[PDB]
Every structure is written in structure tokens, then in C-alpha cells.
Amino acid sequence: SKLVMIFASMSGNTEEMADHIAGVIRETENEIEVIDIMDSPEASILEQYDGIILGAYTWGDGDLPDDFLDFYDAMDSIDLTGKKAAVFGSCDSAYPKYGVAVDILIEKLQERGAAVVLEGLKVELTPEDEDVEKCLQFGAEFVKHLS
Numbered sequence: 001s002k003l004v005m006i007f008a009s010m011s012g013n014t015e016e017m018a019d020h021i022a023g024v025i026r027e028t029e030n031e032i033e034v035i036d037i038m039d040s041p042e043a044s045i046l047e048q049y050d051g052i053i054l055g056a057y058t059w060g061d062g063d064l065p066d067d068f069l070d071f072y073d074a075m076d077s078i079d080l081t082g083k084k085a086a087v088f089g090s091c092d093s094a095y096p097k098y099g100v101a102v103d104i105l106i107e108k109l110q111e112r113g114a115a116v117v118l119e120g121l122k123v124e125l126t127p128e129d130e131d132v133e134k135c136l137q138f139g140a141e142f143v144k145h146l147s
């Protein structure tokens with residue numbers, strides 16, 4: 001199957017997670033295109049993939065990264081019925097609205113008809129060894145839902 005991952009990372013923590021998850025998926029008989037939100041992908045591309053993984057840190061007052069805002073708006077016009085999806089991100093418990101960008105992106109995927117097949121994966125700041133193993137389990141469990 002053909003998969004897409006779109007991630008946002010300012011300081012590198014969510015990108016570390018993205019690279020682990022994608023590297024695990026690449027050891028299966030599936031292809032994945034990993035795209036940084038800074039490179040301005042259009043949301044319509046999500047319609048062309050069998051599975052979708054989004055990654056995002058949380059910013060400001062429990063908001064999406066600034067660079068995700070246009071893409072998020074454009075998601076109101078796409079049809080994701082049938083697709084398998086999941087979301088991850090790095091987080092900081094110095095903030096009350098912890099990792100809520102993950103929850104916001106999950107909600108939007110649900111609204112557009114995607115089957116969200118995993119709980120959101122939240123890691124505190126830079127992954128430690130146990131967090132890295134959680135990234136491996138996320139990728140392995142995601143693939144199981146593909147046909």
C-alpha cells in the first residue's frame with residue numbers, strides 16, 4: 001500500500017519520531033512519502049494515499065503549529081472515507097493543554113471520514129529509549145490495519 005506522512009517540527013523532537021515511525025514502516029512491503037509541513041504540501045494530496053500519518057507539536061495556547069493552519073483549513077474540502085489514519089507528536093507538560101495538536105488533528109481526520117486506527121501518540125520533549133520503542137509499536141500497529 002501507499003502511505004503519506006506529514007509532520008511539523010521546530011526543534012527536532014517530532015521529526016525524530018517521524019523518522020523512526022517511517023523507518024519502521026519502510027521495512028514492510030509498503031511505501032511511504034514523508035513530507036515536512038514547511039515544504040507546503042496541499043491537503044488534497046491526502047486523497048491519493050491508502051494511509052495517512054500526521055505528526056505535530058503543540059504551539060501557543062493549545063494550537064496547531066502556525067505552518068499547519070492553511071493545510072488544516074484545506075482539510076475541510078477533502079474526502080478521506082476509507083483511509084486508515086493516525087497521529088503523533090512531541091509535547092511539554094509545562095503547558096496545561098498538553099499535546100492537544102494531536103487531538104485536534106485526530107478530530108479533523110474523523111470529520112473527513114478517515115478510520116483513525118490508533119490512539120494519539122504523545123511523547124514528552126525529546127524521546128528517550130522507551131519513547132523510541134513506542135514509535136516502533138505505532139508503526140507496526142499501523143501497518144496491521146492495511147490490507
Ligand SMILES: Cc1cc2nc3c(=O)[nH]c(=O)nc-3n(C[C@H](O)[C@H](O)[C@H](O)COP(=O)(O)O)c2cc1C
Pocket residue numbers: 008009010011012013014015057058059060061062063090091092093095096097098099100124125126
Ligand atoms: C510558544 C510555545 C508554545 C507551546 N505550547 C504548548 C502547548 O500548549 N502544549 C504542549 O504540549 N506543548 C506546547 N509547547 C511545547 C512544544 O510542543 C514542545 O517543545 C515540543 O517538543 C516541540 O516539538 P518539536 O521539537 O518537534 O518542535 C509549546 C512550545 C512553545 C515554544
Ligand SMILES: OC[C@H]1O[C@H](O)[C@H](O)[C@@H](O)[C@@H]1O
Pocket residue numbers: 076077078
Ligand atoms: O467537501 C465539503 C463537504 O465534504 C463532506 O460532504 C462533508 O461531510 C461536508 O461537511 C463538507 O461540506
